[PDB]
């Protein structure tokens, strides 16, 4: 009977817990916020069918005021093989070793004996909630040598009379629609396809994603005698706002590198060849450059003016431009401002030598700290300043990175608030290759060089649409955060410098004491309440 006792324990959700993690719930949001619950067990006998189910979370002056819980998850396991290689010093363990990183959506599971198991609860608070204290239990079973175990944990959400509603920070993070690895497998233009990319868009909105990239060039079809057809981008376009994203659209880039990482870039464009629509890249600056974009671009802006999308539209150009090649970026630049003059221009940059060329900076972090009086004056001078995030920075710098503290993640958003930068942007939400994101987690990239783990996707391929990770549930915990810091900011900036200074203390910086952060939440609440 004593080797049947499951040992259970509740854990803060911004700890990662590891299967040979040593034991040790409440939450405390806003109206509109999500409050999440992280329950902890282990059993040193297999369990067979673990299952939980979460019962009514109720008012203590209303039984009737009831909260409405999402279904319960698992944490998943993945194998981080190789490490980031110029690591932060609060790196949770040493590669190689096993993480805690997907959100699983099984109604049951084994559990292996002396495994650690977490149970990761979702409660979203709707804005027309009632503040108060709501209290209840999770009921845990499962089998253990034939017998049947059962356990309750109380479980208390405190809702807060302060309302969150959409979050004024523009969120990125570019998107594949893709189905590999998923029990499905849908064509273009079915509607398994169409069904597959609405769910991906929930997912996005559900998590405050409120800016897509869509590509122009990709998703119309020409006619050259030109005929642009923009059916198949108005489709994407219609579900993303339908589904609550849009919000933002972020046009998909005209072109790229020529060949490697300081070559001139080159630009796509549609010819008539054989009586083929044909694709090619030219440099900016040629004159097949010129007579594409002299109709596509004047088109593409009509279009968008005629659907009412203009005013919510920027372009990108070209990613991540350098110093060396500076020059064929600006031909680039220069072509849309002389046929489009009206369209906002968008980059993830390198190079800070740009002013006139783009109108929405968006500076790789580290970039973004080292030249930041040159941001504050883009910014005084009317333009947008965004930041991003990737395989850099590493070192001390906030990331993503499934060995770096979940406090990071939540963090980037704190950046954006202590220095005003106005948007985030990351180009992996879902970029898996063709090995399983579950078993591969640090995928190939230029040369010998590999993707730290956590930086390719944030979600993960279910059985038909996308599992979130908990660097999810962070990320959209932060994107929140900066609205209830923005809201404190209206009314008493002096508090709300002082509460995010607590946490960051500089761009490289940070305070990710958790407990630290739950009392800077708290007052954050109790001030705006
Ligand atoms: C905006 C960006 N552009 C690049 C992406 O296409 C990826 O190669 C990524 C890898 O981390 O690095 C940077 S982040
Ligand atoms: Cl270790």
């Given at each position: 009977?004593?080797?049947?006792?499951?040992?259970?324990?509740?854990?803060?959700?911004?700890?990662?817990?590891?299967?040979?993690?040593?034991?040790?719930?409440?939450?405390?949001?806003?109206?509109?916020?999500?409050?999440?619950?992280?329950?902890?067990?282990?059993?040193?006998?297999?369990?067979?069918?673990?299952?939980?189910?979460?019962?009514?979370?109720?008012?203590?002056?209303?039984?009737?005021?009831?909260?409405?819980?999402?279904?319960?998850?698992?944490?998943?396991?993945?194998?981080?093989?190789?490490?980031?290689?110029?690591?932060?010093?609060?790196?949770?363990?040493?590669?190689?070793?096993?993480?805690?990183?997907?959100?699983?959506?099984?109604?049951?599971?084994?559990?292996?004996?002396?495994?650690?198991?977490?149970i990761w609860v979702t409660v979203?608070?709707?804005?027309?909630?009632?503040?108060?204290?709501?209290?209840?239990?999770?009921?845990?079973?499962?089998?253990?040598?034939?017998?049947?175990?059962?356990?309750?944990?109380?479980?208390?959400?405190?809702?807060?009379?302060?309302?969150?509603?959409?979050?004024?920070?523009?969120?990125?993070?570019?998107?594949?629609?893709?189905?590999?690895?998923?029990?499905?497998?849908?064509?273009?233009?079915?509607?398994?396809?169409?069904?597959?990319?609405?769910?991906?868009?929930?997912?996005?909105?559900?998590?405050?994603?409120?800016?897509?990239?869509?590509?122009?060039?990709?998703?119309?079809?020409?006619?050259?005698?030109?005929?642009?057809?923009?059916?198949?981008?108005?489709?994407?376009?219609?579900?993303?706002?339908?589904?609550?994203?849009?919000?933002?659209?972020?046009?998909?880039?005209?072109?790229?590198?020529?060949?490697?990482?300081?070559?001139?870039?080159?630009?796509?464009?549609?010819?008539?060849?054989?009586?083929?629509?044909?694709?090619?890249?030219?440099?900016?600056?040629?004159?097949?450059?010129?007579?594409?974009?002299?109709?596509?671009?004047?088109?593409?802006?009509?279009?968008?003016?005629?659907?009412?999308?203009?005013?919510?539209?920027?372009?990108?150009?070209?990613?991540?431009?350098?110093?060396?090649?500076?020059?064929?970026?600006?031909?680039?630049?220069?072509?849309?401002?002389?046929?489009?003059?009206?369209?906002?221009?968008?980059?993830?940059?390198?190079?800070?030598?740009?002013?006139?060329?783009?109108?929405?900076?968006?500076?790789?972090?580290?970039?973004?700290?080292?030249?930041?009086?040159?941001?504050?004056?883009?910014?005084?001078?009317?333009?947008?300043?965004?930041?991003?995030?990737?395989?850099?920075?590493?070192?001390?710098?906030?990331?993503?990175?499934?060995?770096?503290?979940?406090?990071?993640?939540?963090?980037?958003?704190?950046?954006?608030?202590?220095?005003?930068?106005?948007?985030?942007?990351?180009?992996?939400?879902?970029?898996?290759?063709?090995?399983?994101?579950?078993?591969?987690?640090?995928?190939?990239?230029?040369?010998?060089?590999?993707?730290?783990?956590?930086?390719?996707?944030?979600?993960?391929?279910?059985?038909?649409?996308?599992?979130?990770?908990?660097?999810?549930?962070?990320?959209?915990?932060?994107?929140?955060?900066?609205?209830?810091?923005?809201?404190?900011?209206?009314r008493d900036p002096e508090a709300?410098?002082?509460?995010?200074?607590?946490?960051?203390?500089?761009?490289?910086?940070?305070?990710?004491?958790?407990?630290?952060?739950?009392?800077?939440?708290?007052?954050?609440?109790?001030?705006?309440?």
């Amino acid at each position: 009977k004593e080797d049947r006792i499951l040992k259970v324990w509740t854990v803060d959700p911004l700890v990662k817990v590891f299967r040979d993690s040593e034991p040790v719930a409440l939450a405390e949001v806003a109206r509109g916020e999500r409050a999440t619950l992280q329950i902890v067990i282990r059993c040193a006998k297999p369990i067979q069918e673990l299952h939980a189910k979460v019962g009514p979370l109720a008012l203590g002056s209303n039984a009737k005021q009831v909260l409405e819980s999402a279904p319960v998850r698992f944490v998943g396991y993945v194998p981080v093989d190789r490490p980031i290689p110029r690591p932060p010093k609060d790196q949770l363990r040493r590669p190689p070793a096993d993480f805690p990183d997907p959100l699983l959506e099984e109604k049951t599971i084994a559990v292996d004996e002396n495994q650690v198991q977490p149970i990761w609860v979702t409660v979203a608070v709707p804005t027309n909630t009632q503040p108060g204290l709501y209290q209840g239990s999770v009921h845990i079973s499962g089998r253990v040598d034939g017998r049947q175990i059962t356990t309750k944990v109380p479980v208390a959400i405190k809702v807060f009379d302060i309302e969150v509603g959409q979050s004024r920070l523009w969120v990125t993070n570019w998107f594949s629609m893709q189905s590999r690895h998923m029990k499905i497998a849908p064509e273009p233009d079915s509607q398994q396809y169409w069904a597959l990319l609405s769910r991906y868009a929930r997912n996005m909105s559900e998590h405050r994603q409120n800016v897509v990239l869509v590509s122009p060039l990709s998703l119309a079809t020409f006619q050259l005698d030109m005929e642009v057809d923009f059916s198949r981008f108005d489709r994407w376009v219609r579900i993303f706002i339908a589904e609550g994203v849009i919000g933002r659209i972020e046009g998909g880039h005209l072109g790229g590198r020529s060949s490697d990482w300081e070559s001139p870039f080159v630009v796509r464009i549609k010819e008539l060849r054989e009586g083929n629509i044909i694709t090619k890249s030219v440099a900016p600056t040629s004159e097949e450059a010129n007579q594409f974009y002299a109709q596509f671009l004047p088109a593409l802006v009509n279009h968008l003016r005629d659907r009412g999308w203009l005013e919510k539209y920027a372009q990108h150009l070209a990613d991540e431009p350098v110093r060396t090649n500076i020059e064929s970026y600006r031909a680039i630049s220069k072509l849309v401002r002389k046929y489009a003059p009206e369209l906002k221009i968008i980059e993830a940059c390198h190079t800070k030598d740009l002013a006139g060329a783009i109108d929405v900076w968006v500076p790789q972090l580290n970039f973004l700290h080292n030249d930041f009086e040159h941001y504050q004056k883009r910014q005084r001078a009317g333009d947008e300043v965004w930041f991003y995030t990737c395989i850099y920075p590493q070192g001390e710098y906030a990331n993503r990175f499934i060995e770096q503290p979940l406090l990071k993640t939540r963090l980037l958003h704190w950046i954006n608030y202590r220095y005003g930068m106005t948007g985030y942007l990351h180009w992996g939400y879902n970029q898996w290759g063709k090995d399983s994101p579950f078993t591969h987690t640090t995928k190939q990239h230029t040369g010998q060089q590999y993707l730290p783990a956590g930086d390719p996707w944030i979600v993960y391929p279910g059985r038909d649409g996308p599992l979130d990770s908990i660097r999810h549930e962070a990320m959209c915990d932060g994107i929140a955060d900066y609205e209830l810091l923005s809201m404190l900011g209206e009314r008493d900036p002096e508090a709300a410098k002082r509460l995010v200074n607590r946490h960051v203390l500089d761009f490289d910086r940070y305070n990710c004491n958790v407990e630290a952060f739950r009392a800077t939440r708290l007052e954050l609440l109790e001030l705006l309440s």
